[PDB]
From Swiss-Prot:
This is Prothrombin. Expressed by the liver and secreted in plasma. Changing R271Q: Loss of cleavage by factor Xa. It comes from Homo sapiens. The lineage of its organism: Eukaryota, Metazoa, Chordata, Craniata, Vertebrata. InterPro entries: GLA-like_dom_SF, GLA_domain, Kringle, Kringle-like, Kringle_CS, Kringle_sf, Peptidase_S1_PA, Peptidase_S1_PA_chymotrypsin. Changing R271C: In FA2D; Barcelona/Madrid. Residues 508-530 are annotated as: High affinity receptor-binding region which is also known as the TP508 peptide. It is not known whether 1 or 2 smaller activation peptides, with additional cleavage after Arg-271, are released in natural blood clotting. The gene is F2.
Length: 579
């Protein structure tokens, strides 16, 4: 920066910049690259506190340690003060970082490592993967000293030495014959006695099993609910509440049929046996569309076989991966795009499972980290869509709703299991050949299909990836996505990620390859996992799209919430409107 004979000498970084005090033009010859000078000035903005010695400045530039407030950090440390795993700053889950290159580009926010662009006083910090914890300072070693920013106190798992373990075996029959003194709901609200007026009135009018033990006030399961035991409470009529227990991790897989012998070879097509749909709900209370659910009028009723229907056969050579293409119009009559009231913003997806009931993920209504809190007049639904940019009045309908029921056991803290939410249509949609509810299978039907070798059909518009993650380069495609996802068995599913595979979830997706990231993070928030049944000639919904692990880290599968256990729960809502 002086000694004009040194102006005959082209400036260097390590020379004029660190040790001397290089100008921006000196720094410029001293780095050439524009991004190099960008990072250079970001550091020097954060590294005036470490200008000298050269070790201080170099350690502040590199960022593999903590200097000053540590916003210059660029190391590998992905562990907070309390030890909660760091959230990737590209993934908006759990806590959506509005802080990126748009707000404070200098901090140069990395893949998963801690970052302090918004100048938190706690030192370098990272969004905690825990939804109950937004940020947290990390154990970032101080530049020039054997000191980390925070003493390492990881969140150790619960100690089993201080907890009294229950030695009761996990209750079968879904708590039908439970005898314990638990007379309060899952979260502690006490259940009324069955001798009370409302509980007795509900037992008299309902088809509650007599063999199921009807105790004074304890929550029971006389209707054969698969979600667990339950009870009614006083207040608004029809209120239902579970009473959580030591329920086993139960899946439809572990039941051995008494009619399907050991002859599993050469899958046999149904011999002129069209299944009579034994209706499970009453048409007066559940509404229309029950009997003829899940049939495309222009495809199955018109005898038109779609291109990718034959691709559901697992007998394909190695089951070659199917890429979702420009779908035919109206192949998904029950999918609904849930937009925000104003402005028109594609927020979530939902399933029109009946003529007056809509199933959507509870995440579409409440998630504390993203600050979403919805009322009745804050959302609109659009049913029968093919392209979002056009309102094709020729097919779709624009609707509002009138009531929404939140699943009581919605626990967003740990794993978003039981991601359940029901909605009632304010304006019933006139029947059409392009709109049709999808059937909800029973346990036996789902078990048969999983044992029938039919691959599922996953529908989505690609909003899942952009909602969960913020990668740039692949905007929203202009056509609907429909893919044939084979069912993944439980072992590879559990081994794929550290998130517990809860009792209400199963697997789906392709098997990933080395270097070739699959399409497991395609779809919409709150979407259904649809499958085809050659045994019933109809389509079924089995899973709800939950938070996918394929969006955060490479090579992950799809994990989705069980829905075939909802039937006994479903009645619990419709009697709230059938009284
Ligand atoms: Ca110089
Ligand atoms: Ca000089
Ligand atoms: Ca000069
Ligand atoms: Ca120079
Ligand atoms: Ca020099
Ligand atoms: Ca030197």
């Amino acid at each position: 920066a002086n000694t004009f004979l040194e102006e005959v000498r082209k400036g260097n970084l390590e020379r004029e910049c660190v040790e001397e005090t290089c100008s921006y033009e000196e720094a410029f010859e001293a780095l050439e690259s524009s991004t190099a000078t960008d990072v250079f000035w970001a550091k020097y903005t954060a590294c005036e506190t470490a200008r000298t010695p050269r070790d201080k400045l170099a350690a502040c530039l590199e960022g593999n340690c903590a200097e000053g407030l540590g916003t210059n950090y660029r190391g590998h440390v992905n562990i907070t003060r309390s030890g909660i795993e760091c959230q990737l700053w590209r993934s908006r889950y759990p806590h959506k970082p509005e802080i990126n290159s748009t707000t404070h580009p200098g901090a140069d926010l990395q893949e998963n490592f801690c970052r302090n662009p918004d100048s938190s006083t706690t030192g370098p910090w990272c969004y905690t993967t825990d939804p109950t914890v937004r940020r947290q300072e990390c154990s970032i070693p101080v530049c020039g000293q054997d000191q980390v920013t925070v003493a390492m106190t990881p969140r150790s798992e619960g100690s089993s030495v201080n907890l009294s373990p229950p030695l009761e075996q996990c209750v079968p029959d879904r708590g039908q014959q439970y005898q314990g003194r638990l007379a309060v709901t899952t979260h502690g609200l006490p259940c009324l006695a069955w001798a009370s007026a409302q509980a007795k009135a509900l037992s008299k009018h309902q088809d509650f099993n007599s063999a199921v033990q009807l105790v004074e006030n304890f929550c029971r399961n006389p209707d054969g609910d698969e979600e667990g035991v339950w009870c009614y409470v006083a207040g608004k009529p029809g209120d239902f509440g579970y009473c959580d227990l030591n329920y086993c991790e139960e899946a439809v897989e572990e039941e051995t049929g008494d009619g399907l012998d050991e002859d599993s070879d050469r899958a046999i097509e149904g011999r002129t046996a069209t299944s009579e749909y034994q209706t499970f709900f009453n048409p007066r209370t559940f509404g229309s569309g029950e009997a003829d659910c899940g049939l495309r009028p222009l495809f199955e009723k018109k005898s038109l076989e779609d291109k990718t229907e034959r691709e559901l056969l697992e007998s394909y050579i190695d089951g070659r991966i199917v890429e979702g293409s420009d779908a035919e119009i109206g192949m998904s009559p029950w999918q609904v795009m849930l937009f925000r009231k104003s402005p028109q913003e594609l927020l979530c997806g939902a399933s029109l499972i009946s003529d007056r009931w809509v199933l959507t993920a509870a995440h579409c209504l409440l998630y504390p980290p993203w600050d979403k809190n919805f009322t009745e007049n804050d959302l609109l639904v659009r049913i029968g869509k093919h392209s979002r940019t056009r309102y094709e009045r020729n097919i779709e309908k624009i609707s509002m709703l009138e009531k929404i029921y939140i699943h009581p056991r919605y626990n967003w803290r740990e794993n978003l299991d039981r991601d359940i939410a029901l909605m009632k249509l304010k304006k019933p949609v006139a029947f059409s050949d392009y709109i049709h509810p999808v059937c909800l299978p029973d346990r036996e039907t789902a078990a048969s299909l999983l044992q029938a070798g039919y691959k599922g059909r996953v529908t989505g518009w690609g909003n899942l990836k952009e909602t969960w993650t913020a990668n740039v380069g692949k905007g929203q495609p202009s056509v609907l996505q429909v893919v044939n996802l084979p069912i993944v068995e439980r072992p590879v599913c559990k081994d794929s990620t550290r998130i517990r595979i809860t009792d209400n979830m199963f697997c789906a997706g392709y098997k990933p390859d080395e270097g070739k990231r699959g399409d497991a993070c395609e779809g919409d928030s709150g979407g259904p996992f649809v499958m085809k049944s050659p045994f019933n000639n109809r389509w079924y919904q089995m899973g709800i799209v939950s938070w996918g692990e394929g969006c955060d880290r490479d090579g992950k599968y799809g994990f989705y919430t069980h829905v075939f256990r909802l039937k006994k729960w479903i009645q619990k809502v419709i009697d709230q409107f059938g009284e």
